DNA sequence: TCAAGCCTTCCTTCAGGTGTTGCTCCAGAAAGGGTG
DNA sequence: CACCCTTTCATTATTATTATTTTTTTTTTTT
């Protein structure tokens, strides 16, 4: 069954990309070398096909999230939420390999390879939390196929499909912004602000002549430490920006479809960024859409009482014995 | 009241224009000169004339955006429309002040655009009070509908592509059912197409109008039988109707301010029933939802002349202007550009061929970017790949 | 390839800061009072893989209905990831002629008819049948190169 | 614990943003080459999606202050206000390399690879402080999510929550203000002025000499001079803002601490331009979890978070900044 | 510490725009074209978010002494009235960089990439005047914040609002004002008046003649422009901050509001156009005004005046030395 | 009731930004030890 | 022997990086 929740972000999103990105003061994104570059790392986007234009296919770059934050998103608010508080009102104590199989898609409960008989594959595919995600030594499918945090955006729309073509963007939604860090000991007043500091003026003026030192030095060598005074750049997704996140389960229980909905209740506390400083991918949840029909509402979920009293009944029976023998 | 409540199964025919209907009922329109001819028979509609000259596009798409003194005067033009005595006043002028204090009260709210426009006869006052977003009635129309059939001409964009004909009329996705086209392949074997065209871009200058009209000559003496010549624009049509009378006379058709499609084409069936051969210089609904196919001879197609030639002058860009299409533009960008000027295209070449049996049809393209090496004209040519020789 | 192949990178790490919350509100027993980012529980592991969008075409000889009907079902191909690769836009099956299809672009084994073995067949430790990752039914092969 | 604090600038905002712009006399801003273009720092833009006439959602520029900037601001509030001076009323000190990490995070560059510690991750995420800014060599997260500053504007309805639609402004919100450095020695009007300047009226001749050659240097060409006429581009005053300060399961002595950051936020500028005036702001309103707990005085209210606070700073020591600072390796 | 000085304008305000702004002969600013224009700068103007409709809040034009203009006139009135005194009568005498760095803030247009050391920085924070505006070419942040001068008026009642709603004033504040420069030759008219030229009435005469030919890039005397002014008489506060100021600083900002009467607020000088008197000085919400001069608050002025005995232009000379 | 403005000015030089600014770390797991 | 610390070893080496260029029509048959 699919549940496909349109988000807005009202903050920033921001998912870090790999290489080595440079882009100039003025915005120019990897100059040829020798001019001043910039170290820029770009929010992750992956190169999609495009039917946009003419019949032909071209490769257009679209700012995602990738699917395996939004797996883990998913996966750690219900832990937080549902999860631990049911598991410490009744005294569950988990163990690192179990913890470390139901937090983390690792298999450090035992590093060998653990067969699994059928009966027990199916016992712990129909458990609301395990069975969605899986992990561990077993490396037993999930059922919970959490895909990309995707934008609505023409870029992709042949991810996208028909029927969000209302409400869509267009152009560029990056924005670089450029963030920075300063020596705070060059921002010291007087005598009373630099009291607290052992040494005081002493301890300042000699990070001051350090710092000078250096930085002529490194200039000296231009024609190995570092200094605080930084000033970089990172591309972000535009704020107020509307998401589309498809959630498939490949033959869901009760249960399972519960506890996702739970999370989705719960999940406007969560965040979605590599910017958790400074507040980025904070966001609203405006619809959530199980097989076709929508189910959000502004007041949480209405909706699904079947799956909402499935889950109570599920979180209320776990003891934790079935995360220590998922795990070893 | 006149249609049940909910409708179990419905069946439009010529859905392509159906939109267009609701984009021509949710307009409500304020006419000055019947009102001012009718209270005649208040100064301050005069007052909201010489504000309403102060605001070539004049006010589009702006439902609020400027009211220096728009609604000041707009509530005065209610207030002495409404008060004025039923008693007395005739029954035919009821109606005018009616509709006019209707479109001033859609005016009001601030839920609707405003778009000025003028009549072809005279520079009158003309104001709409439109919706450029129609997703809620057109979507309270969908929950009343049970099952839809959508049966149109052109209906979809590229092979089972009908993305934007369910953004067009707001159908639901979930309820949304596309299926696969016929295109039937009579549709597009009688027909000519000709390498030929004319080397002028089409710039709305009067050399192209020249080198054009020397091309329409040249069809018109190959001509067998009618002739269709398609433009987008009145000004470019009369610089063809400038560059052609002279030369040829009693032969042509021009459509202008105060010629209609269907004068028009009652002279195209007047003098073909003649046997002169006619050219039409045909624009607006020349292009669209014209029957070109004689109704004297009804059994035996293979002898249809009464239409020999299509030509297309120009590519229709920039034909829709409605509020929903600028809307819808403004979300989509170029590509809702590119695929209505495709649609528009389709419905111009679709009065060729409208029964089959017909035979020795010609097509013309003269427009200089189709065979240019530009890439927005991309389906401008497969769809002129349908076609061979 | 309808696009150039690209790259995708994946990391995996478990949230330290939770598990320290954790081990302290006592639903964490962790003797250790470090991680280790090399290694481990709380490992942080990166990993890239290649990227393709394409069309994929093979040739086969069975019943069309029946492999439509797997195919319908068919909602990713070449990773199951679950975290969103492959998606099917859609699929297509048509009969052809005999001589034009290549059957034999596949991994054979070695005592293969000489009319099947082609030149950029190879021989090499393969899987030729059922699960094509499980190593111990992999078999003295010759395969085709991608 | 996500605090919505509403408030309101009394003088101008300017936070600017790198880059090479340009703008003319009359105000064409990234003008073409080939036209007289003057140097412009435009303020801080933040591209937001927004909702322009009807449907179009479309990428639009709001001014803003950045996360960092605010978030820095609440980190200065906080420590030269509360931290600091109840911790140099005692003994305690910190070292340089602790202050590095109290006031910026960290006390270095190339920090170390190693992680650290669970009970030490554990125990400063508890601080009143130190868990709400967690840097130092061993990267910690931070419990403080400071939200960029965002006026309450009609091009951040998506960015806004519900029941500001009222009081809030629609339009252009930025001014261009221009500075032009003018030669002060130029504006001596007397050798009675001269006197105290170096040499009477010989330096002052030299300078002028100094001026001319820079001038047909430059004139001919087409150092550098003390002429600096420049425009930067601000956020108009008056506005009504909207800044979000969330907290992630917080304990009560840190909400207590931004509380009484916010209590003491008057007479602290926001973003730059300190010379100007630019950035004094009074606040409106804080929304402690949706509740309405600011009158004009201060908080008066929350009575736990003040109380957690004063228990917190009064056994408040240097010693967890310093196991915050060092470095493991 | 709030300085919150109440000042009326006795003359009109005229602070210039840049740009290019236009006229007609009547009030049109900034006509469309084919109609004879005027060239036309105005007051340099902030917009406010204001509430036009009672509830409806709009960015409205409000006509403001700059805050820059401000501190540069806060620097030359302390500069010139006391930091000038005390330095000519103990014999200090500083450079020319070190007088450029008094005023301008910046003894050269580039600054040394460096940061200064913390002992001096605390120096020349504790400087009363260095200290309020910092500069050099280390970059030095001072101690004081000067706003822009704000007329009491509907639109500065969302920046201003402290006690003041009923001598706050309603209605548009501007004016224009008209200057023509005419030749001056074209007004003699006279053989007595022609003597005092240096070739006389042939001399004035071929003046004429290059006026005709000119009348029909060399540019003559000829000019007729606008210039766009608040209005004389009403009342305006200025929001002076101090960040952590010492008493000596806060003393010398005291000594310049007590000289402040013979200033000129910067603006047309010819037409006597900066000249105010101050109705008040709120000190914290402390109103220490009177029409003698400042009374109470004495413990400032006993700070600067030790302050102002023993200032040395050693610190001037070593706060604009580069790298 | 007539008079119900004629002409001419339409801005001149300046005004160019300077410094810094380049990222950092890591994404190993088998080796011995030590402790319940 | 399950829970961890902390030691240990390894050989070559270079660096490129997709982004756009409308026309301005007057239809239709609602209240």
Redesign the pocket.
């Known amino acids: 069954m699919q549940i496909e929740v349109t988000v807005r972000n009202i903050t920033p999103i921001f998912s870090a990309a790999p290489?080595?990105?440079?882009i100039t003061?003025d915005g120019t994104?990897?100059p040829p070398?020798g001019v001043?570059?910039?170290?820029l790392?770009r929010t992750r986007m992956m190169?999609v096909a495009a039917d946009v234009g003419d019949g032909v296919i071209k490769?257009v770059?679209l700012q995602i999230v990738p699917g395996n934050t939004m797996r883990s998103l998913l996966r750690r608010t219900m832990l937080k939420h549902v999860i631990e508080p049911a598991l410490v009102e009744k005294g569950n104590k988990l163990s690192?390999g179990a913890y470390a199989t139901a937090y983390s898609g690792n298999a450090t409960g035992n590093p060998d390879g653990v067969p699994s008989s059928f009966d027990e594959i199916a016992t712990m595919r129909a458990h609301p939390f395990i069975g969605l995600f899986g992990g561990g030594p077993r490396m037993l499918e999930g059922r919970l196929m959490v895909d990309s945090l995707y934008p609505i955006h023409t870029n992709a729309e042949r991810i996208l499909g028909a029927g969000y073509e209302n409400e869509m963007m267009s152009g560029p939604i990056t924005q670089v912004v450029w963030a920075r860090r300063m020596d705070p000991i060059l921002n010291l007043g007087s005598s009373e602000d630099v009291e607290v500091i052992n040494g005081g003026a002493v301890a300042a003026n000699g990070w001051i002549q350090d710092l000078l030192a250096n930085?002529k030095a490194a200039?000296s060598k231009k024609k190995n430490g570092?200094?605080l005074?930084?000033?970089?750049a990172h591309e972000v997704v535009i704020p107020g920006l509307k998401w589309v996140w498809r959630i498939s389960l490949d033959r869901p229980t009760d249960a399972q479809v519960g506890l996702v909905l739970l999370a989705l209740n719960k999940m406007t506390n969560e965040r979605i960024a590599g910017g958790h400083s400074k507040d980025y991918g904070r966001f609203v949840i405006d619809g959530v859409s199980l097989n076709g029909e929508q189910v959000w509402s502004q007041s949480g979920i209405t909706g699904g009482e079947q799956y909402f009293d499935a889950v109570a009944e599920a979180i209320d029976g776990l003891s934790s014995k079935e995360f220590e023998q998922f795990a070893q | 009241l006149s249609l049940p409540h909910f409708i179990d199964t419905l069946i439009v025919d010529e859905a392509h224009l159906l939109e267009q209907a609701f984009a021509?009922?949710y307009?409500?329109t304020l006419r000055l000169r019947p009102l001012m001819r009718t209270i005649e028979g208040l100064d301050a509609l005069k007052e909201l004339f010489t504000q309403m000259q102060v605001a070539?596009?004049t006010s589009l798409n702006v439902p609020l955006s400027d009211v220096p003194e728009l609604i000041p005067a707009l509530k005065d033009t209610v207030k002495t429309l409404g008060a004025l005595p039923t008693k007395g006043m005739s029954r035919d002028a009821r109606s005018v002040i009616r509709?006019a204090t209707?479109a001033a009260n859609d005016a009001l709210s601030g839920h609707s655009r405003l778009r000025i426009?003028?009549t072809?006869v005279h520079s009158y006052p003309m104001l709409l009070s439109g919706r450029s977003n129609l997703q809620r009635a057109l979507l309270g129309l969908w929950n009343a509908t049970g099952g839809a059939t959508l049966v149109s001409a052109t209906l979809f964009t590229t092979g089972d592509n009908g993305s934007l004909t369910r953004w067009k009329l707001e159908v639901p996705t979930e309820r949304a059912a596309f299926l696969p086209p016929v295109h039937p392949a009579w549709t597009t074997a009688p027909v000519l197409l000709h390498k030929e065209f004319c080397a002028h871009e089409p710039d709305?200058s009067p050399e192209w109008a020249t080198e054009c009209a020397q091309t329409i000559q040249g069809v018109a003496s190959t001509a067998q039988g009618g002739t269709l010549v398609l433009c987008?624009?009145?000004?470019?049509t009369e610089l063809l109707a400038g560059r052609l009378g002279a030369a040829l006379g009693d032969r042509l058709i021009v459509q202008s301010?105060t010629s209609?499609?269907a004068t028009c084409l009652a002279q195209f069936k007047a003098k073909h029933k003649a046997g002169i051969r006619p050219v039409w210089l045909g624009?607006?609904?020349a292009w669209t939802?014209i029957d070109l196919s004689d109704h004297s001879l009804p059994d035996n197609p293979e002898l249809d002349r009464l239409l020999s030639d299509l030509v297309i002058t120009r590519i229709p860009?920039?034909?829709?202007?409605s509020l929903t299409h600028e809307r819808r533009?403004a979300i989509g960008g170029?590509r809702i550009?590119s695929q209505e000027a495709a649609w528009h295209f389709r419905q111009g070449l679709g009065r060729l061929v409208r029964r089959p049996g017909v035979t020795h049809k010609n097509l013309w393209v003269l427009d200089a970017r189709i065979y240019g090496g530009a890439?927005?004209v991309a389906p401008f040519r497969q769809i002129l790949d349908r076609y061979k020789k | 390839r309808q696009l150039?192949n690209?790259m995708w990178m994946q990391?995996g790490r478990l949230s330290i800061v939770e598990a320290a919350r954790h081990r302290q509100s006592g639903y964490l027993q962790?003797?250790?009072?470090?991680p280790?980012?090399?290694?481990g529980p709380f490992?942080?592991?990166?990993y890239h893989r290649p990227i393709v969008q394409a069309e994929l075409t093979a040739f086969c000889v069975g019943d069309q209905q029946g492999i439509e009907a797997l195919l319908s079902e068919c909602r990713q191909i070449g990773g199951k990831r679950g975290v969103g690769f492959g998606q099917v836009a859609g699929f297509k099956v048509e009969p052809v002629a005999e001589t034009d299809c290549p059957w034999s672009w596949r991994a054979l084994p070695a005592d293969a008819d000489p009319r099947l073995v082609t030149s950029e067949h190879a021989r090499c430790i393969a899987a030729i049948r059922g699960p094509y990752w499980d190593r111990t039914l992999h078999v003295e092969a010759l395969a085709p190169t991608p």
Do not use: C, M
């Not at chain 1, 001043?36 to 170290?39: D, E, L, N, Q």
């Not at chain 1, 005074?229 to 970089?232: E, T």
């Not at chain 3, 962790?30 to 470090?34: H, I």
């Open positions: 290489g080595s990105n440079y003061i994104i990897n070398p001043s570059r910039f170290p790392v190169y490769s770059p690192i930085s200039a570092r200094g005074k930084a000033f970089n | 021509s009922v307009t409500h070539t596009n509709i209707r426009e003028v072809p709305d987008t624009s009145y000004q470019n301010k209609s499609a624009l607006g609904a939802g860009v920039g034909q829709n202007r533009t170029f550009i890439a927005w | 150039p690209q990391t962790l003797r250790a009072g470090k280790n980012p090399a290694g490992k942080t592991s990166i």
